[PDB]
Amino acid sequence: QKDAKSSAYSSRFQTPFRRRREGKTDYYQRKRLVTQHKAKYNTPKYRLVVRFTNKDIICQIISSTITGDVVLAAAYSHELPRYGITHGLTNWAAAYATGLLIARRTLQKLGLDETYKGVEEVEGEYELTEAVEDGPRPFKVFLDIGLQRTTTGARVFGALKGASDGGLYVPHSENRFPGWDFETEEIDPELLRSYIFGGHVSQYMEELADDDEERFSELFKGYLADDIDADSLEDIYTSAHEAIRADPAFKPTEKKFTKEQYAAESKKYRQTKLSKEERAARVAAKIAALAGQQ
């Protein structure tokens, strides 16, 4: 009796929450992330949600309400070609760039853009957003990693660094950053800055070029086609930083179509449910053919 799921088993089974079943959200962490001080009655608690799909990075600033989460402003990695980041949309430097972009976008949305300029000349050093005399406090967000593994040299912390140098006061420690040595509790701003500007990709480029050309042709093919080199990706990352700070306004796409047309084509293609009368007809057909032996 191996495959024994009885009616009583199914009846007493208590399903988890839908997102827990889907394996998308951790409610143990979410409760502490979204539960607010009750004497801070209705003041929103903002999370910088960072999610890493394949070939895309999603960064959002979300607050929680009863009817569902509400988004302040979101920056995706797929809009980084607009600022000049076409290749490596998921890597550490892209995560930093999109975090900086969402920080700038949210500051511009809230009017806190001229003040709290952030860090424009980044060095990989661990810094906090200082208090300003007689001025509004920096926008405070808490990093949301979901099910991602908090570990040293992670692009979730790359996006965190992007936001923190963007100007969003996101409380963090420097010990999860790349360049951190466990033996000596001292950050390496040089290694962190190389990770910021793609050094961990430029050095791989150089090593692959000088030791294995076949892998250089197999991957980095787009880099070859667009003629980017180990000196130039740092240039493009700095230029993208500058463009992001210049215009975070988030102009969207034209969709090339109409939502109604999308709905029409997808609806026409999609499978359709049967009506109850025709379901009874199918049962009757099975009765008359299979059961009755004609």
């Binding site: 049962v283 099975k286 009765i287 299979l290 059961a291 009755g292 032996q293």
Partner: protein
């Protein structure tokens, strides 16, 4: 050397089953509950006669065994062992208590009286209601008078008033005689070992055709 049944006749206490807390109670006097041709098919024994209780009281395991033995013996002696099926529909689960000590004259010196009077298990009883079935006999309609006579014989071993009612149902089933007959002329019923199985209008047609071949194979 057991206490008279008049002491435990009435349902005075809450149910006191053998459990993790009693954990030491005597065996029930009655261990057989089906007698006669218990393997018979539902069609074979169409008539059902019930010995029913008109009183809310307790039936002892001793009384249940005595009545079962008497009715079984009478059925066997006047119509044979395979002309009926007798089923006891009450199981003795309530445990009776007694505070019994060493018996002696002048025991008041060491009896302790009613101090610590909680009793030890000494019996078992069946807690029956009004209208609750005590006995059920299914047989052929030719054996109706024999079966009612045997149930009348069994009635003397019980306290309180019992009635004998001929059920409208077919044998031990839940369908009356005409409804069972209609479902049997249809393919709705399938004879299991002794009882019967019904074809629900719900369920998977694949299983309904694996089972019940006759209903669909018209």
């Amino acid at each position: 050397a057991r206490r008279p049944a008049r002491c435990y006749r009435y349902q005075k206490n809450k149910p006191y089953p053998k459990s993790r807390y009693n954990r030491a109670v005597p065996d029930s006097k009655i261990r057989i509950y089906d007698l006669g041709k218990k393997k018979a098919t539902v069609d074979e024994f169409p008539l059902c006669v019930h010995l029913v209780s008109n009183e809310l009281e307790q039936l002892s395991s001793e009384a249940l065994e005595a009545a079962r033995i008497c009715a079984n013996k009478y059925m066997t002696t006047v119509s044979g062992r395979d002309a009926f099926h007798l089923r006891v529909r009450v199981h003795p689960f309530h445990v009776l208590r007694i505070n019994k000590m060493l018996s002696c004259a002048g025991a008041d010196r060491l009896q302790q009286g009613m101090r610590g009077a909680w009793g030890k298990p000494h019996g078992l009883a069946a807690r029956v209601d009004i209208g609750q079935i005590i006995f059920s006999v299914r047989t052929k309609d030719s054996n109706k008078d024999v079966v009612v006579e045997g149930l009348r014989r069994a009635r003397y071993k019980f306290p309180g008033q019992q009635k004998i009612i001929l059920s409208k149902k077919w044998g031990f089933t839940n369908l009356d005689r005409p409804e069972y007959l209609k479902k049997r002329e249809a393919g709705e019923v399938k004879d299991d070992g002794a009882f019967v199985k019904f074809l629900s209008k719900k369920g998977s047609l694949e299983n309904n055709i694996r089972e019940f071949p006759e209903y669909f194979a018209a």
